[PDB]
Amino acid sequence: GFKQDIATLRGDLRTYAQDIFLAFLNKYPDEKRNFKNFVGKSDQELKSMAKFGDHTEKVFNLMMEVADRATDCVPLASDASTLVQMKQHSGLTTGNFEKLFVALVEYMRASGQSFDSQSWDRFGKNLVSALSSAGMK
């Protein structure tokens, strides 16, 4: 289930973080509007870029903590507030986060592994709801 999935992703986090983030950017190309340094680059080129690996690792490090602190896939309000008040997130709306988790769930469903895809779908929806509650447009 959800708790084991957190362990699975953490066990190979640089690989999963990069692959899931690439699935997101390739499914939703216009989201690169938020990541200009990643434009005009193939997956293999991004995986050799220092700032790409550092960004994806830091994002998924924090995502896994938020997941780990959740109860029944409901994140802490404090974690939602942190994500909304982050200066790096100033321009963002909830649709951006929805798309990230649609891509993550699709990646899990397409993998050969027994991820608990429905729990991550719920987690994404509850996080979007919590982001909205905390003031994200």
Ligand code: HEM
């Ligand atoms: C649960 C989901 C997310 C988590 C855990 C997360 C986490 C993070 C973290 C840890 C940073 C770096 C903060 C620092 O350097 O101190 C960051 C930066 C950033 N994030 Fe997120 N993030 C999430 C979702 C998103 C989404 C959906 C977008 C869509 C555009 C986004 C856009 C950005 C941008 C634009 C930056 C900074 C620009 C840069 O990379 O230099 N984030 N995020």
